[PDB]
């Protein structure tokens, strides 16, 4: 757009073009959609001198390139293919500026890459810079990816300050489009010890959480990955309320997960609740198997029930086959029904 060299290249004037021919133009090329691609591909296969030629020009405008729509990719490649020297130099340009990079659309991609590429020491140093700004970053459309990458790569001791910043915020952040994903990473990667007060905070809001469009995902996650004690606390919040919750757009997810991932005792208890209870004139199962949300629960319930309980269920189902075939999701129920006698 500015150099003839650039515009010529952008017109297939140089089929045999090489990094060496780009001296005094690397930054220009790095900012250009096709130039950036050209440099990326050449860097993957270059001699060390070629790589250092490139690195010399880019270092002079590294912060600029880290925040550029196409330049950021060239910075990323040095985190993959670059020397300790080269990686240290870049980390020095980042030092002091982790916060506004983390919050920037392309800078946060650089930070993420850096975190996969540097020593634990340098990781921990970078992460520190966010101290005082965790909640801002957790809720930021760019920053939350940075925080997630931290939780995934950095020694958990070094993330205590992030856990600490959550005191009193677990509910709010769990019902947040981006927050909830951070909570999930924490539950996956941090120690049992660390997550204690998080879990505590979740248990106090199970009722609201299971009904929230993001929150239900946090609860689900505990059901799939947490320790029994925590699953039990969730299950005990579901008992008594199974029929109603099965019909909720979001709470149905959590009920399903209890059927699938709770202990076998708990499963039985949830199945039994719905086989005994009536709903108005008809049966609780009747309501459920016809509901767009609840029927998936019934499906899973048949899948998980022991021979005994599966015999009870199919017998409560049988007198409604004619009035069941109305619904396409009845086809999955009938498939398991016909796959049960001969």
Swiss-Prot record:
Subcellular localization(s) per the UniProt record: Cytoplasm; Cytoplasmic granule; Cytoplasm, Perinuclear region
Start and end residues of each stretch annotated as Uracil-nucleotide binding in RNA target: 72-76, 216-220, 295-299
Any GO BP annotation: positive regulation of sprouting of injured axon
Shown residues within the full chain: 706 to 1049 of 1066
Tissue: Widely expressed. Expressed in embryonic stem cells, heart, kidney, lung, skin, intestine, spleen and thymus. Expressed at intermediate level in brain and liver. Weakly or not expressed in muscles and stomach. Expressed at various stages of myeloid and lymphoid cell development. In the testis expressed in the spermatogoni, spermatocytes, spermatids and Sertoli cells.
Domain PUM-HD: 1-341
Record's function text: Sequence-specific RNA-binding protein that acts as a post-transcriptional repressor by binding the 3'-UTR of mRNA targets. Binds to an RNA consensus sequence, the Pumilio Response Element (PRE), 5'-UGUANAUA-3', that is related to the Nanos Response Element (NRE). Mediates post-transcriptional repression of transcripts via different mechanisms: acts via direct recruitment of the CCR4-POP2-NOT deadenylase leading to translational inhibition and mRNA degradation. Also mediates deadenylation-independent repression by promoting accessibility of miRNAs.
Swiss-Prot/TrEMBL domain comment: The pumilio repeats mediate the association with RNA by packing together to form a right-handed superhelix that approximates a half donut. RNA-binding occurs on the concave side of the surface. PUM2 is composed of 8 pumilio repeats of 36 residues; each repeat binds a single nucleotide in its RNA target. Residues at positions 12 and 16 of the pumilio repeat bind each RNA base via hydrogen bonding or van der Waals contacts with the Watson-Crick edge, while the amino acid at position 13 makes a stacking interaction.
Subunit structure and binding partners: Homodimer; homodimerizes in vitro. Interacts with DAZ1, DAZL and NANOS1 via its pumilio repeats. Interacts with NANOS3. Interacts with SNAPIN. Recruits the CCR4-POP2-NOT deadenylase leading to translational inhibition and mRNA degradation. Interacts with DDX20. In case of viral infection, interacts with DHX58.
Entry's Gene Ontology cellular component terms: cytoplasmic stress granule; cytosol; glutamatergic synapse; neuronal cell body; nuclear membrane; perinuclear region of cytoplasm; postsynapse
Name of encoding gene: Pum2
Name of the protein described by the UniProt record: Pumilio homolog 2
Spans annotated as Adenine-nucleotide binding in RNA target: 36-40, 108-112, 180-184
Pumilio repeats mapped onto the chain: 21-56, 57-92, 93-128, 129-164, 165-200, 201-236, 237-272, 273-315
């Amino acid at each position: 757009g500015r150099s003839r060299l650039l515009e010529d290249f952008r017109n297939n004037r140089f089929p045999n073009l090489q990094l060496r021919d780009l001296i005094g133009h690397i930054v220009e090329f790095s900012q250009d959609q096709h130039g950036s691609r050209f440099i990326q591909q050449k860097l993957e296969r270059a001699t060390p001198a070629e790589r250092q030629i490139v690195f010399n020009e880019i270092l002079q405008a590294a912060y600029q390139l880290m925040t550029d729509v196409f330049g950021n990719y060239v910075i990323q490649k040095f985190f993959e293919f670059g020397s300790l020297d080269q990686k240290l130099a870049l980390a020095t340009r980042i030092r002091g500026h982790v916060l506004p990079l983390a919050l920037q659309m392309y800078g946060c991609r650089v930070i993420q890459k850096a975190l996969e590429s540097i020593s634990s020491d340098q990781q921990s140093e970078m992460v520190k810079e966010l101290d005082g700004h965790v909640l801002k970053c957790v809720k930021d459309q760019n920053g939350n990816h940075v925080v997630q990458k931290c939780i995934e790569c950095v020694q958990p001791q070094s993330l205590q300050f992030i856990i600490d910043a959550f005191k009193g915020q677990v509910f709010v952040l769990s019902t947040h489009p981006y927050g909830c994903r951070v909570i999930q990473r924490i539950l996956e990667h941090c120690t049992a010890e660390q997550t204690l007060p998080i879990l505590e905070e979740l248990h106090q809001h199970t009722e609201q959480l299971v009904q929230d469009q993001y929150g239900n995902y946090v609860i689900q996650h505990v059901l799939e990955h947490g320790r029994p004690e925590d699953k039990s606390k969730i299950v005990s919040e579901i008992r008594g309320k199974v029929l109603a919750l099965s019909q909720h757009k979001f709470a149905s997810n959590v009920v399903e997960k209890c059927v699938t991932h709770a202990s076998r005792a708990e499963r039985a208890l949830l199945i039994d609740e719905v086989c005994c209870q009536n709903d108005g004139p008809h049966s609780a199962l009747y309501t459920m198997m016809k509901d767009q949300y609840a029927n998936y629960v019934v499906q899973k319930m048949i899948d998980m029930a022991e021979p005994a309980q599966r015999k009870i269920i199919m017998h409560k189902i049988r007198p409604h086959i004619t009035t069941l075939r109305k619904y396409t999701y009845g086809k999955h129920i009938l498939a398991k029904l016909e796959k049960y006698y001969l």
